[PDB]
């Protein structure tokens, strides 16, 4: 809410989030929930 | 003898001069067999002369008397020694037979016929004569099958052998109904060698041992007849290299594998190598220490089932990764150990709590205390204990001596297998002496490697 990605200088993270990658392997979701099954296509998965 | 001028071999490879001399090679072999039987008899007589009856033999640095005792000679319940005359007789018989074998080897090495082919065609051979090679292999397979059947006959009719798993602490037992089931016998040889499985080292009873020996003796006899009456197939002829050095390399690989396996038997197996004669194994001694401290602190009360270690995992008892109740501490790594002094205290879920509270036998207590005090740890100048221990105890386990020596022998014989397999391939191909300098293969290859 008060520290979203665009307040943190994230440039490619919005482009990942725009097309559906919203979970990370760190257990968090970009919308603030908990990701228990982030799958292969997390942020780190797309990076790898 | 020969020389480098006529043979191409220097003195340090002088035994290679015997490659194509059948009679002299036979003489070297028979003299060597006499040497082996000589060491057997002399070491046996040395061990019986230095044997002390009241002490356990594994405290006396003995490796052949434990073998003869495991065969069931001169020992009683708990492996107590009753007589040493069988061991003395074994040593004497080996020493005299070694004298006979030494005479034969010296004769055939010195004044026997140099080659056996012209005057004794039954014993004559060339290395590329595959039929005669399989004939000799078949004769030796028959002899080995007869030896395995000799072990079977001993165990079945001629006094039995020492069962460490006999109730009450082990005794010499007649094996009745050996395990002849093919599934049980051949499941050992395809079992994984890793922890909890152990391949063939994990054979844990005399029935399986004697049944497997029935199987190996019958298979050796049948294969011996097969190789007497057959010729190697064309696929074998294409696959193998047919020369004396190649056959030597095959045997070197086989005996290297056998030496590594014997190392593992001496280190892990307590059935074919009873702890009463060979001392405890490493796992046995560690589990014995855990059991001894458990029974001590439960004599002092202390509720060993609920006592908790500094890490929080359990001081005396814990769980295996599959759920069995096991001894706590680093001896968790030895949770798969099975021994006659601890198996009556285990039920289906592992160490039974009420059985461990109420059913601890005095013989189990004594054996565990002894095995804790005689762990297979020591220095090569025979100072018992860990490397930090002071010079007080003159003890090294026979299991440790056997495992160290036979790992070294297995490794060197693997190296010798590599040496002779490579040299046999290079000599069959024709470049064991070097590159021709006029038909160098690489100079005819396309560059850029």
């Amino acid at each position: 809410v008060l520290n979203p990605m665009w307040r943190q200088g994230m440039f490619v993270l919005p482009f990942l989030t725009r097309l559906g990658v919203t979970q990370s392997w760190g257990g968090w979701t970009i919308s603030g929930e908990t990701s228990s099954n982030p799958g292969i296509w997390s942020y780190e998965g797309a990076a790898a | 003898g020969r020389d480098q001028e006529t043979t191409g071999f220097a003195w340090w490879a002088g035994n290679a001069r015997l490659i194509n001399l059948s009679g002299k090679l036979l003489g070297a072999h028979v003299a060597h067999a006499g040497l082996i039987v000589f060491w057997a008899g002399a070491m046996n007589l040395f061990e019986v002369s230095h044997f002390v009856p009241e002490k356990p033999m594994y405290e006396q640095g003995l490796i052949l008397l434990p073998h003869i005792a495991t065969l069931g000679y001169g020992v009683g319940p708990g492996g107590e020694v009753l007589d040493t005359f069988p061991y003395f007789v074994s040593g004497v018989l080996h020493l005299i037979s070694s004298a006979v074998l030494g005479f034969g080897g010296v004769y055939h090495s010195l004044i026997g016929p140099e080659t056996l082919e012209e005057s004794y065609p039954f014993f004559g051979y060339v290395w590329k004569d595959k039929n005669k090679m399989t004939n000799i292999l078949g004769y030796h397979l028959i002899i080995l099958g007869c030896g395995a059947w000799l072990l079977v006959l001993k165990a079945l009719y001629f006094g039995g052998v020492y069962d460490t798993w006999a109730p009450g602490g082990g005794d010499v037992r007649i094996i009745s109904n050996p395990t002849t089931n093919a599934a049980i016998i051949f499941g050992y040889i395809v079992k994984s060698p890793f922890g909890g499985d152990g391949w063939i080292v994990s054979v844990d009873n005399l029935e399986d041992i004697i049944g497997g020996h029935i199987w190996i003796g019958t298979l050796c006899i049948l294969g011996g007849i097969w190789h007497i009456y057959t010729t190697p197939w064309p696929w074998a002829r294409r696959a193998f290299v047919w020369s004396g050095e190649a056959y030597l390399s095959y045997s070197l690989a086989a005996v290297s594998l056998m030496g590594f396996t014997a190392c593992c038997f001496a280190w892990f197996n307590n059935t074919a190598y009873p702890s009463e004669f060979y001392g405890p194994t490493g796992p046995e001694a560690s589990q014995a220490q855990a059991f001894t401290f458990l029974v001590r602190d439960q004599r002092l009360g202390a509720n060993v089932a609920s006592a908790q270690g500094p890490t929080g995992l359990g001081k005396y008892l814990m769980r295996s990764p599959t759920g069995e109740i096991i001894f706590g501490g680093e001896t968790m790594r030895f949770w798969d150990f099975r021994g006659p002094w601890v198996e009556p205290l285990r039920g289906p879920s592992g160490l039974d709590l009420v059985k461990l509270k109420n059913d601890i036998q005095p013989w189990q207590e004594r054996r565990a205390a002894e095995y804790m005090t005689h762990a297979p740890l020591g220095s090569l100048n025979s100072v018992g204990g860990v490397a930090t221990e002071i010079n007080a105890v003159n003890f090294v386990s026979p299991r440790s001596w056997l495992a160290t020596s036979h790992f070294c022998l297995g490794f060197f014989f693997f190296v010798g297998h590599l040496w002779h397999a490579g040299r046999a391939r290079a000599a069959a191909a024709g470049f064991e002496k070097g590159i021709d300098r006029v038909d160098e293969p690489v100079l005819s290859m396309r560059p850029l490697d």
Partner: protein
């Protein structure tokens, strides 16, 4: 996990069979020597 074990068993068996039948395929004849 059983699918992974089946795949790994197939892969290991394939490579081991290649090794075995490669040395069965007249290997002592594949050398530049005379003989």
């Amino acid at each position: 996990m059983l699918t992974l074990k089946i795949f790994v068993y197939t892969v290991v068996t394939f490579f081991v069979g290649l090794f075995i039948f490669g040395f069965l395929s007249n290997d002592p004849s594949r050398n530049p020597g005379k003989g």
